Amino acid sequence: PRRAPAFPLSDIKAQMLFANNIKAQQASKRSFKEGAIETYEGLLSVDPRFLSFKNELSRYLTDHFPANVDEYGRVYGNGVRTNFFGMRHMNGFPMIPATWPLASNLKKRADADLADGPVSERDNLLFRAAVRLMFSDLEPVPLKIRKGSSTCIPYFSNDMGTKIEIAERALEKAEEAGNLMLQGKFDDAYQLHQMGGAYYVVYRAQSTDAITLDPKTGKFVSKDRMVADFEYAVTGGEQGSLFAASKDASRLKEQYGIDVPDGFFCERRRTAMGGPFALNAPIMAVAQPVRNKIYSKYAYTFHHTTRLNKEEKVKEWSLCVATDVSDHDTFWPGWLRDLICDELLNMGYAPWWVKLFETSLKLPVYVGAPAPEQGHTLLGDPSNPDLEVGLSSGQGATDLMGTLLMSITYLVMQLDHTAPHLNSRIKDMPSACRFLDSYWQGHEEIRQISKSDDAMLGWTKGRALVGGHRLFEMLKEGKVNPSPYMKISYEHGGAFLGDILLYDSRREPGSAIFVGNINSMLNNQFSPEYGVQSGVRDRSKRKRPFPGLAWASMKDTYGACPIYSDVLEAIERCWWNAFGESYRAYREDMLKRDTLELSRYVASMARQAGLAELTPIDLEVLADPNKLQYKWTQADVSANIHEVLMHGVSVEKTERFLRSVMPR
């Protein structure tokens, strides 16, 4: 059922993805790379004292603070959901091999018994109403670009000036490029305007992953992560194999001379993709206004800031169901891309723009280096984009694509299992739009708070409440999938956007509180995804610009965890044992140094201004801007801080572009 074409790097089709410059050529050829990360300035992730610390701390905390999660996956008591062994990884050393990305998810979806389109006309109206509400009366804003981000295919530039020029040129030529694609001239659109080509596959670390201690043997066991070989990926699973990657770290002693303590493993590696910037720029120019609309008009469902902001909504509910989605991005349906595109056309969106958007979700993928002596292969033909990878992580609107799919999926689940009395309100497009507009503002007896694959579903008092409890029971039993669209289950230890919903003895939302996840504090402080990048002089371009700043926001972020004080004391005691130093004093020094360094980047900040005007969100984001790509948005960050991390194309150029895309 159609194998995807594959081209080696030597092939002209793969060569055309890389411009005639050192950076692009190095990206094409980059071999498998691994090595210890610089966790903090002058500290490697594999430092024997650091690993000794992780061994003592993970064992102590698991022993003294076992998980408090009930039969229904509700967190209570200590606010702990699993053991603390997740920190036991040799950061910077990946599992081998990493997965080859699936070229087609059609078989994957069919085999999981998931629908190949909207099941009913009601569902079709609801998905289409989501498009109408999300993409209608948008306001133009500057096109914001992350500083130090790559333009990927074909230039691989990290220079802001070059990136601004590429983005402005893309907005000027998007119409001509989209019209060429409408004629089936994909090679012309790419050759002339760099719109097309492929996604560039980067493998990112998921620094912490499940590890258990087998009581029978006293040996640690790492969670098996299934990977697809090349044959499996190209055939959509028809041929080839799906097998457990090797997380065994014993190899590091032989290969690198690194002492590996017992129960330490190689990190989970996830596929991530970088989009061709010229194609993403016209998409981002529409995506940002869409986010501004949904986070303002539909703030109830979509705009999530603090633990208290989430708590205020959830406390009003009689039932709160914390859902889990299996492998969201790989299962994301291509029929939804086509439905969205068809609906945008119906709304009066420029057909050339819709074509660029459609093409961004069918694009070939260039596989770099999943393992030593593997990769350097283009999957799919750029002359006719026809892949079904699901949702590409570097597509200009991935957050919105996952949010659109999931918000409707959850609403459909509430309608099907709890609220058949609301079906009469969804008769046609105008009534579907009115209903959805009301539901998204939190005006119905059925409610939700969601972001991509994370959500909490709510029921107030009323007719749907009894159904709500049956649905929760069906999820606990876990024998029947409640959705025809995605694989849905309940979360083992219900949390929403990093905050754990801590229930008391009553196990009711009205007396439950949102608290910071103490395990995430440990993940962020002792298992960062990236090194400090001490060699990158411009800190705003680093993956972790100001790591020291996270110490200042720690009490605000995690202070509400029942075991906060206990964890900090355990850290202090273990760090003294391992380094013969005070961890608290070490972090206070790093905080001071990073605070001083920050003023160099903020125009409004004098030589030694201090953190006085900054919010806890500002500080968490400056230590980890990745939180701005999954947890928060632009409006949540102080304006002067957002400027440290992002730069924009003028609203004059985007305003003109937006006028040409949008209906009449």
Q: Which residues pair with 377 in a beta bridge?
A: 8, 367
State the residue number with the nearest CB to Mg ion.
454
Amino acid at 258: I
CB of 84 to Mg ion, least distance (A): 20
CB of 561 to Mg ion, least distance (A): 17
d(CA 649, CA 277): 14
Cβ 267 vs Cβ 222: under 8 Å: no
494 is in an annotated binding site: yes
- DSSP string computed for 620-661: HHHH-GGGGTTT--GGGS-HHHHHHHEEEE-HHHHHHHHHHH
Q: In 3-state terms, what secondary structure has residue 266?
A: strand
Interacting span for Mg ion (CB under 5 A) from 206-214, 284-292, 447-455, 599-607: 447-455
Interacting span for Mg ion (CB under 5 A) from 30-38, 163-171, 350-358, 451-459: 451-459
Contact set for Mg ion, span 462-521 (CB under 5 A): 491, 495
478 is in an annotated binding site: no
Name which of 495 and 662 has its Cβ closer to Mg ion. Answer: 495
Name which of 79 and 547 has its Cβ closer to Mg ion. Answer: 79
Determine which residue in the list 444, 454, 594, 643 makes contact with Mg ion, applying CB under 5 A.
Answer: 454
Which DSSP helix (H) or strand (E) runs through 378?
strand 377-379
The radius of gyration computed from the CA coordinates of the chain, to the nearest angstrom, equals 25
CB of 324 to Mg ion, least distance (A): 6
For 262, other C-beta atoms within 10 Å of its C-beta total: 9
CB of 5 to Mg ion, least distance (A): 38
d(CA 339, CA 337): 6
Name which of 86 and 380 has its Cβ closer to Mg ion. Answer: 86
CB of 455 to Mg ion, least distance (A): 6
Name which of 341 and 495 has its Cβ closer to Mg ion. Answer: 495
Name which of 322 and 570 has its Cβ closer to Mg ion. Answer: 322
HSE-up (13 A, CA, CB side) for residue 597: 17
Name which of 491 and 643 has its Cβ closer to Mg ion. Answer: 491
CB of 322 to Mg ion, least distance (A): 5
Compute CA distances 133 → 312, 434, 534, 538, whole Å.
25, 9, 45, 40
Cβ 64 vs Cβ 569: under 8 Å: no
Cβ 526 vs Cβ 87: under 8 Å: yes
- DSSP string computed for 55-96: HHHHHHHHHHS---B-TTS-B-TT---S-SGGG-EEEEEE-B
Interface with Mg ion, residue 123, by CB under 5 A: no
Name which of 499 and 620 has its Cβ closer to Mg ion. Answer: 499
CB of 589 to Mg ion, least distance (A): 36
The CA-based dihedral angle spanning residues 646, 649, 650, 655, taken in that order and rounded to the nearest 10 degrees: -120
Residues in the interface with Mg ion (CB under 5 A) total: 3
490 is in an annotated binding site: yes
Which residue ranges make up the annotated binding site?
453, 490, 494
Binding-site members for Mg(2+) are 453, 490, 494
Footprint of Mg ion (CB under 5 A): 454, 491, 495
